[PDB]
């Protein structure tokens, strides 16, 4: 937790070079991907090794939303697309089972957090699609609040994304960054405002999206979006993540070093450099030695094994119900 930088590792086991870089104080987390996941035991061993190499507390995170975005599937309960809960007759009840189950099984495998939930509105943006909980404000709020309650219940920190709303985004040749040219995105942002005000988000990830009515920069590299709006207008007090600086970020600024500088000056607390070990190293060398003490809030609050978890009727039911829900609409 201590440092701002999130990076990844190459495979199923920690390398000797991994063990060295994990000790760099500017590192605060490892983001895991599908290529880091083979099986439950291998995952447990990998995370144990990460925490031992780091020595100090360190965050381990994953994109585990359900549906199209679930890095760990084999040997885990399948989680439905976030869209599916609101299609069921008891959606709010099931959304909480989905969030609880997703979070519980990650904690059982020594993972601190999932970069979830998606608070975007609508299904028309290809990148989002059925990752959204609904296509109007109330449906999104109702079902995302349930999912959040489930995460909270097991001690997992929560991350709203992709602020200030990725639901209506276009990524064609009209501009060089995905964009949303609407004169107002008030409804999209109202979802974020509501969850911020309810105090249910520990963290926030911004969208790599330009909203030209508002500001020239992608929100993820925008002083307006991340300070003026997110902090001053909206009163968000949690952790702000960057986007993946390796393929997103303020691309016009230059390389990883320039993108990292812009993310931090814009108001990100923590920065992500994925898929590019040599870029992570470059950024570590460029930056001051940095600390993010408030990121300790993101470390998981509970500890238990998968065996212990499965003894809960709550697990027995949630797991079965998620499989039913998937089968109901797939
Ligand atoms: C629009 C989109 O999918 N953005 C993703 C985000 O959800 C994810 O948490 C992050 C880390 O993998 O990479 C991206 O920025």
């Amino acid at each position: 937790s201590l440092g701002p930088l999130w990076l990844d590792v190459a495979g199923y086991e920690l390398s000797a070079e991994d063990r060295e870089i994990l000790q760099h104080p500017t590192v605060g987390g490892v983001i895991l991907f599908g290529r880091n996941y083979h099986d439950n035991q291998q995952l447990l061993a990998l995370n144990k090794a990460i925490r031992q190499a780091a020595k100090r507390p360190i965050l381990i995170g994953v994109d585990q939303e359900g549906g199209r975005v679930q890095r760990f599937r084999e040997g885990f309960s399948r989680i439905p697309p976030a869209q599916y809960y609101a299609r069921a007759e008891n959606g709010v009840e099931l959304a909480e089972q989905g969030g609880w189950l997703m979070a519980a099984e990650l904690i059982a495998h020594d993972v601190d957090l999932s970069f979830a939930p998606v608070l975007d509105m609508g299904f028309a943006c290809k990148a989002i699609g059925n990752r959204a909980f609904g296509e109007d404000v109330q449906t999104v709020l109702k079902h995302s609040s349930a999912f959040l309650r489930g995460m909270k219940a097991v001690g997992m920190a929560t991350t709203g994304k992709h602020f200030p709303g990725h639901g209506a985004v276009i990524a064609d040749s009209h501009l060089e960054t995905p964009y949303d040219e609407r004169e107002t995105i008030a409804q999209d942002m109202a979802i974020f405002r509501a969850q911020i005000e309810a105090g249910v988000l520990d963290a926030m990830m911004p969208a790599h999206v330009v909203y030209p009515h508002y500001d020239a920069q992608p929100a993820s590299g925008s002083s307006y979006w991340l300070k003026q709006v997110l902090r001053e207008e909206l009163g968000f007090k949690g952790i702000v993540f960057s986007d993946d600086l390796s393929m997103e970020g303020a691309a016009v600024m230059g390389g990883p070093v320039e993108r990292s500088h812009q993310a931090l000056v814009a108001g990100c607390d923590m920065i992500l450099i994925c898929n590019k070990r040599e870029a992570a190293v470059e950024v570590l060398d460029n930056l001051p030695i940095m600390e993010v003490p408030q990121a300790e809030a993101l470390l998981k609050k509970q500890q238990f094994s998968y065996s212990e978890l499965k003894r809960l009727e709550r697990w027995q039911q949630a797991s079965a119900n998620m499989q039913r829900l998937i089968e109901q609409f797939s």
Side-chain angles (χ1 to χ4, degrees):
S1 168
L2 277 137
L5 173 69
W6 290 76
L7 47 59
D8 53 12
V9 302
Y12 300 144
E13 281 183 282
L14 230 47
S15 71
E17 64 176 8
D18 290 338
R19 295 178 185 272
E20 285 172 14
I21 200 170
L22 283 170
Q23 297 181 75
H24 191 113
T26 297
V27 177
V30 179
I31 178 163
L32 298 169
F33 292 103
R35 70 177 139 266
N36 301 119
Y37 184 67
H38 189 267
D39 60 75
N40 296 251
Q41 176 177 318
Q42 158 280 325
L43 176 61
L44 277 161
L46 176 63
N47 288 338
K48 179 189 182 74
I50 285 163
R51 296 192 194 287
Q52 65 67 221
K55 283 99 216 191
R56 71 199 182 288
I58 188 168
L59 292 162
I60 308 185
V62 60
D63 295 309
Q64 194 89 333
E65 303 168 20
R68 286 163 56 222
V69 182
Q70 182 173 347
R71 305 311 189 198
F72 315 147
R73 292 175 189 192
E74 298 198 1
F76 273 70
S77 299
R78 197 71 161 94
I79 308 307
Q83 176 192 81
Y84 282 21
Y85 309 116
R87 298 170 67 184
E89 62 176 7
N90 65 150
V92 170
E93 176 176 36
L94 290 182
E96 185 169 23
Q97 291 178 202
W100 187 89
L101 180 66
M102 180 284 283
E105 295 197 341
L106 286 183
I107 289 162
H109 295 80
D110 194 29
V111 172
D112 289 287
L113 67 80
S114 178
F115 297 101
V118 168
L119 295 182
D120 304 318
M121 181 175 75
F123 311 129
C125 172
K126 72 306 147 198
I128 305 304
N130 66 14
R131 298 167 64 196
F133 281 92
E135 59 182 10
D136 59 69
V137 166
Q138 224 40 50
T139 303
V140 173
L141 281 178
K142 218 169 265 200
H143 300 88
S144 72
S145 302
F147 192 95
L148 285 160
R149 291 198 289 281
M151 298 175 64
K152 190 197 184 300
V154 284
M156 176 173 290
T158 59
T159 302
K161 63 191 198 176
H162 310 80
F163 176 88
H166 207 297
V169 161
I170 299 154
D172 67 11
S173 58
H174 171 55
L175 294 169
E176 300 188 9
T177 299
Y179 61 92
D180 184 350
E181 281 179 327
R182 284 177 297 167
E183 283 199 2
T184 183
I185 61 159
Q187 289 188 64
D188 304 60
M189 214 189 320
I191 290 157
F192 291 95
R193 181 189 288 279
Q195 302 298 37
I196 294 163
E197 266 156 36
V200 297
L201 302 180
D202 299 301
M204 194 79 84
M205 195 189 272
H208 177 59
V209 173
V210 180
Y211 307 84
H213 190 275
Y214 296 83
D215 190 77
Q217 295 302 315
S220 59
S222 178
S223 300
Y224 171 72
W225 286 115
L226 309 183
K227 289 189 301 162
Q228 174 56 31
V229 182
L230 183 53
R231 302 297 192 185
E232 311 195 352
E233 297 173 6
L234 298 183
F236 185 59
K237 306 262 63 171
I239 293 283
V240 179
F241 294 123
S242 72
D243 55 354
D244 177 19
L245 299 187
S246 295
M247 286 173 61
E248 300 177 303
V252 298
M253 303 294 294
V257 171
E258 293 81 19
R259 291 178 204 192
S260 303
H261 184 265
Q262 183 53 27
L264 290 163
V265 183
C268 298
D269 294 308
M270 303 191 94
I271 58 165
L272 283 63
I273 303 167
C274 309
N275 306 333
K276 296 182 193 179
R277 175 54 60 79
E278 81 163 25
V281 168
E282 191 175 12
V283 172
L284 264 4
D285 290 347
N286 175 262
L287 256 16
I289 302 303
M290 299 179 65
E291 213 177 79
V292 190
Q294 71 273 35
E296 293 167 45
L298 303 182
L299 294 160
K300 60 181 182 64
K301 311 297 210 184
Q302 292 183 34
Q303 181 180 149
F304 51 79
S305 78
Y306 201 20
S307 282
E308 289 167 353
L309 178 57
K310 291 170 168 173
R311 297 170 192 149
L312 272 67
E313 296 81 3
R314 185 158 176 181
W315 184 86
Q316 293 156 23
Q317 298 295 310
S319 60
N321 291 165
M322 291 312 89
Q323 193 50 51
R324 274 211 162 196
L325 183 50
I326 278 157
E327 293 172 9
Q328 188 177 353
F329 299 111
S330 51

